[PDB]
């Protein structure tokens, strides 16, 4: 997250310096053309305007490359941590005999990882909602489906506690705490 | 390479320098596009054991990545074109202005030499033809690759062609104020005025 925040800052600076430089150069070109007819001055300014629009399209495009690269990496980290937390939960659930509090530890790490997947999904989606309504509209179906998969994955892991009903009551209140975020 | 083009003053080698900078940009973008495509595909490989929905979101990011890279390329390409067009237009306008001045000056000289006026009129009309031909040609280029962008600039293309035609006819009408000269080069004038039709 920090590495992305740092590249994001360098990108904004880079975009600012370039926008300022090009603007200053083209305006310098407009000054040298102050003695030219009104029509020649307009088409030059029109070129400057097209120049600005291409620069803004370039800037947004480079920002999108950063974001797509960032999102993919975060999703990889969230999916991998969840996998390892799930394995440790299964292994602790199959141990002989099963100690209810080593299982509680493993269940905590898994459920909280799912919450972290949940938190990142909602946060990024709300971010897109605030700045780009149509992009949010496009990802809307997939956002909901993923949140539903997280919920199913949760309940699915919890259903494994039914297969050991005794342990489930010895940590029922901690589980209820965990489930209340 | 390409960046140097933007800080190189227009001259007679502007067109060539632009053509090579245009080519270097297309190559650099393809090289960048290829490198990135390879990297993400390895990430698609490393995620092959994942559920079908999770690989979809990864592939979907790659698609969004390609779309961003293509927007970056076209954007950098348009910057090149806008810079080039301004440079060509300034050289064309300066050449027309100098030729029109020499034509006016030759027209008011005492006495007016009919072949000095002809010589000057040739440089002007041919400068006007170079502007006209450039306008049509760039338009055809945009038509060939981006029909929708061409349709939007068409109106300005037509107006620019109209101004050229107006400047032409007005400059030619000034020959009526010098009845002697106009008769001795009428046939040269008629040839000149039909050039590049």
UniProtKB/Swiss-Prot annotation, chain B:
Q: How does it assemble?
A: Interacts with CPEB1. Interacts (via NPXY motif) with DAB2 (via PID domain); the interaction is impaired by tyrosine phosphorylation of the NPXY motif. Interacts (via cytoplasmic domain) with APBB2/FE65L. Interacts (via intracellular domain) with APBB3/FE65L2.
As annotated in Swiss-Prot or TrEMBL, what is the tissue specificity of this protein? Answer: Expressed in placenta, brain, heart, lung, liver, kidney and endothelial tissues.
Cite the entry's keywords alphabetically. Answer: Cell membrane, Copper, Disulfide bond, DNA-binding, Glycoprotein, Membrane, Metal-binding, Nucleus, Phosphoprotein, Protease inhibitor, Proteoglycan, Serine protease inhibitor, Signal, Transmembrane, Transmembrane helix
The subcellular localization recorded is: Cell membrane; Nucleus
Function summary:
May play a role in the regulation of hemostasis. The soluble form may have inhibitory properties towards coagulation factors. May interact with cellular G-protein signaling pathways. May bind to the DNA 5'-GTCACATG-3'(CDEI box). Inhibits trypsin, chymotrypsin, plasmin, factor XIA and plasma and glandular kallikrein. Modulates the Cu/Zn nitric oxide-catalyzed autodegradation of GPC1 heparan sulfate side chains in fibroblasts.
Give the primary localization class. Answer: membrane
Q: Which family does it belong to?
A: Belongs to the APP family.
PTM per UniProt?
The BPTI/Kunitz inhibitor domain is O-glycosylated.
Q: What is this protein called?
A: Amyloid beta precursor like protein 2
Domain (E2) ranges: 1-192
Q: Which GO terms describe its cellular component?
A: endoplasmic reticulum lumen; extracellular exosome; membrane; nucleus; plasma membrane; platelet alpha granule membrane
Portion held of the full protein: 373 to 569 of 763
Q: Name one GO molecular function term.
A: transition metal ion binding
One example of a Gene Ontology biological process annotation: axonogenesis
The answer on whether this UniProt entry bears the keyword Transferase reads no
Q: Which organism is it from?
A: Homo sapiens (Human)
Which superkingdom does the taxonomy of this entry point to? Eukaryota
Look up keyword Ligase and say if it applies.
no
């Amino acid at each position: 997250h920090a590495r992305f925040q740092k590249a994001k800052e360098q990108l904004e600076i880079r975009h600012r310096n370039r926008m300022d430089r090009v603007k200053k150069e083209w305006e310098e070109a407009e000054l040298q053309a102050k003695n030219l007819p009104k029509a020649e001055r307009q088409t030059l300014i029109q070129h400057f305007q097209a120049m600005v629009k291409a620069l803004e399209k370039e800037a947004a495009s480079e920002k999108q490359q950063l974001v797509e690269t960032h999102l993919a990496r975060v999703e990889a980290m969230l999916n991998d941590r969840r996998r390892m937390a799930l394995e440790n939960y299964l292994a602790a659930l199959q141990s002989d005999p099963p100690r209810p509090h080593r299982i509680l530890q493993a269940l905590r790490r898994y459920v909280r990882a799912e919450n972290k997947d949940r938190l990142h999904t909602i946060r990024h989606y709300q971010h897109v909602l605030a700045v780009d309504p149509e992009k949010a509209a496009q990802m809307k179906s997939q956002v909901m489906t993923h949140l539903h998969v997280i919920e199913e994955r949760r309940n699915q892991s919890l259903s494994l506690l039914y297969k050991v009903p005794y342990v489930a009551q010895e940590i029922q209140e901690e589980i209820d705490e965990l489930l209340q975020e």
